[PDB]
Design a protein around this ligand. Structure first.
Ligand SMILES: [Fe+3]
Ligand SMILES: [K+]
Length: 329
């Protein structure tokens, strides 16, 4: 057949996935690619389902793309999101640390503060910030989740085990690993800061602009720069923690339908990409932000043939993840 089983994480994404399915059906000849929706409680279940031949595709943050490639799943990156514009595609985005203006603390004064993370293992929300703060964390630094919980005075790290690490869910009881948790992901980590639960939100450079439409409102927030200074949210290019690779669609290595997945997404971006349709949009939704794909994405780029997560992500980001897990001071 020609159906790509897409893995939607929870109700909000499932809704957008069904709309994705219906709209594609309304414009695609019965000759082209179709989309079926498989709903899961977490991205972890999506990875398992795909390896088990129960689903075919799911978009993951780069940190999770790395995790998906590890045994026994061994998933491969097949289609990447790109940002910026079609004219000059960016296969990366900036990891930033958003804070409220006048809160009186720098990067080197994060100990004792409250943190809002997009999710455990994610680029901007975990890998990058925790990697930079690693040696500041109290010993024993392993397990990492506990050292981080001990460092801050309460946090929200979605997908973390609230039984083993209670304080990592102090700002979002249960540490839900989906949009059901209002403090999950980019928009959720930011809401965690805006509502007053946290002192810092580890998100992407575009998150505040996507969740705060007014400039006067944004002026009440700032970014923590690596040199222990603060700068306006519009100056993320000169005040970020690191550049990280795009969120990417992964699939099985064997019988993964990578060709159909690309065919589906390439046709999907033409019909429902940025500014393409008044009926449906792949990169936004009335049901929420960053559902299925990031709202900041402008399109898709095909990953070279047979490329694995390690080669795709690049030695630098891979080394960043390995240093986090293995490294010391
Ligand atoms: Fe991300
Ligand atoms: K603590």
């Amino acid at each position: 057949d020609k159906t790509v089983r897409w893995c939607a994480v929870s109700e909000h994404e499932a809704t957008k996935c069904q709309s994705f399915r219906d709209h594609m059906k309304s414009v695609i000849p019965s000759d082209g690619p179709s989309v079926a929706c498989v709903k899961k409680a977490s991205y972890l279940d999506c990875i398992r389902a795909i390896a088990a031949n129960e689903a075919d595709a799911v978009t993951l943050d780069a940190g999770l793309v790395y995790d998906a490639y590890l045994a026994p799943n061994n998933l491969k990156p097949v289609v990447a999101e790109f940002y910026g514009s079609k004219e000059d595609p960016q296969t990366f985005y900036y990891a930033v640390a958003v804070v409220k203006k006048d809160s009186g603390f720098q990067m080197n004064q994060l100990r004792g503060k409250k943190s809002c993370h997009t999710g455990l293992g994610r680029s901007a929300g975990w890998n990058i910030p925790i990697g930079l703060l690693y040696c500041d964390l109290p010993e024993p630094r392993k397990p990492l989740e506990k050292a981080v919980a001990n460092f801050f005075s309460g946090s929200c790290a979605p997908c973390a085990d609230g039984t083993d690490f209670p304080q990592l869910c102090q700002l979002c009881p249960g540490c839900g690993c989906s949009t059901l948790n209002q403090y999950f992901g980019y928009s959720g980590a930011f809401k965690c800061l805006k509502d007053g639960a946290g002192d810092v939100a580890f998100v992407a450079h575009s998150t505040i602009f996507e969740n705060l439409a007014n400039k006067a409102d944004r002026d009440q927030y700032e970014l923590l720069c690596l040199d222990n200074t603060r700068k306006p949210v519009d100056e993320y290019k000169d005040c970020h923690l690191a550049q990280v690779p795009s969120h990417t669609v992964v699939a099985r290595s064997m019988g993964g339908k990578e060709d159909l997945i690309w065919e589906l997404l390439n046709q999907a971006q033409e019909h429902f990409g940025k500014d393409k349709s008044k009926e449906f949009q792949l990169f936004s939704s009335p049901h929420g932000k960053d559902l299925l794909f990031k709202d900041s994405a402008h399109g898709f780029l095909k990953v070279p043939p047979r490329m694995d997560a390690k080669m795709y992500l690049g030695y630098e980001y891979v080394t960043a993840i390995r240093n986090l897990r293995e490294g010391t001071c």
